[PDB]
Amino acid sequence: NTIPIGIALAQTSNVALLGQEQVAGAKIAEKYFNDKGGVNGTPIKLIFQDTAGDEAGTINAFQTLINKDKVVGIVGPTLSQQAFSANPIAERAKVPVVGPSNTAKGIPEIGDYVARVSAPVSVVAPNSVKAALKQNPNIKKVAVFFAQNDAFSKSETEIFQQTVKDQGLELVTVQKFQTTDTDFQSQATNAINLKPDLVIISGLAADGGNLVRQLRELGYQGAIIGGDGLNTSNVFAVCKALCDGVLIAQAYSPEYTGEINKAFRQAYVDQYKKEPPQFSAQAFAAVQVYVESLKALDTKNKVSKIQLPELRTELNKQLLTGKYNTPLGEISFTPIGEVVQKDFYVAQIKMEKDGSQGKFTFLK
Numbered sequence: 001n002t003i004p005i006g007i008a009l010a011q012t013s014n015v016a017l018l019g020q021e022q023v024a025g026a027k028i029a030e031k032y033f034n035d036k037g038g039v040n041g042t043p044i045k046l047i048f049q050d051t052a053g054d055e056a057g058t059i060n061a062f063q064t065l066i067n068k069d070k071v072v073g074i075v076g077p078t079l080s081q082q083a084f085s086a087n088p089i090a091e092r093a094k095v096p097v098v099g100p101s102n103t104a105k106g107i108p109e110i111g112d113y114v115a116r117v118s119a120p121v122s123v124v125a126p127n128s129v130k131a132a133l134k135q136n137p138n139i140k141k142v143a144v145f146f147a148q149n150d151a152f153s154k155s156e157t158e159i160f161q162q163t164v165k166d167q168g169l170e171l172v173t174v175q176k177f178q179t180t181d182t183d184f185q186s187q188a189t190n191a192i193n194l195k196p197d198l199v200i201i202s203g204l205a206a207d208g209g210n211l212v213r214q215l216r217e218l219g220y221q222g223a224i225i226g227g228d229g230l231n232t233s234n235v236f237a238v239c240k241a242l243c244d245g246v247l248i249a250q251a252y253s254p255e256y257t258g259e260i261n262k263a264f265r266q267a268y269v270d271q272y273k274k275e276p277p278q279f280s281a282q283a284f285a286a287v288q289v290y291v292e293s294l295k296a297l298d299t300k301n302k303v304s305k306i307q308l309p310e311l312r313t314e315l316n317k318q319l320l321t322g323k324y325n326t327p328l329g330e331i332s333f334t335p336i337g338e339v340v341q342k343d344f345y346v347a348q349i350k351m352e353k354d355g356s357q358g359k360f361t362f363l364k
């Protein structure tokens, strides 16, 4: 007998450059928590339903997890764009959702069954601007690019634009693209002609990494910040050597000395031979929130004997009240399911072996 927890992530499509890191973290969490006894003796069972990269796929995954797989709660989806489209299904069904990577403004406000462990763009993104200015104090002109078809990218770019203007910098252009684009020559050229010292990109990984390449190939030599959509080790194979030096803010540090983080990190390194990335840590944390909340319920009433609709509502109520020492540090929730997290970091991509392998190097 097991407790089914739904995992709805982008396992396929270009969005899987991000989603597969989340799958990896979720799988590590399942083994970790079950090795520790699951929920007071009752194992959890993660049930994966691929969302692909679109709204339709996410709607399908949520419907299946709720109705066919009868899950007690969902971790997912990968994109805020997908969350806005599919989370109302869970809200209507009164099934909790914990977003592992949905950082757009407005996610917690979708409803009282929606929470997130992923800190919002407003608190995360400005850290990389601050880091860029520390590395080059004489940056004056900034060019910004964003994916206008994506809810997160639109939300993130607003943060970046306001942040740079508030720092007294000159925003010379805001260039639009689509996450599905492959050619960025015209936007890159138009930005380059305006002589920026810093370029900031809000998109996803396949698109973002190719935009980085095309900027460099057109002769742009200045600093580059990538937003959270580029924040995956799978971007290294996209921009290759041209990824080198890109600054990306982080909501996770592999070096945090919490016991659970140390165990998570060890398991990740053992399996993948690299340090755990943010999205893996955040996915682990989402599973942890469910496991520890189920344990809290279980001490009062055995979870394996609670009927599903009741269990779902009680689980949602419980998780919002919990405090958790996760890979992300100590976290808790506001009454609408926003994460409470104050520690953030910045990393810089360091490439090696003629662009064939890379790592996120954390700035001190």
Ligand code: PRO
Binding pocket: 018, 078, 079, 080, 081, 101, 102, 103, 104, 152, 228, 229
């Ligand atoms: O909210 C989103 O869509 C992006 C995906 C990775 C981090 N946040």
Ligand SMILES: [Mg+2]
Binding pocket: 107, 108, 109, 110, 111, 112, 113, 114, 115, 335, 336, 337, 338
């Ligand atoms: Mg909420």
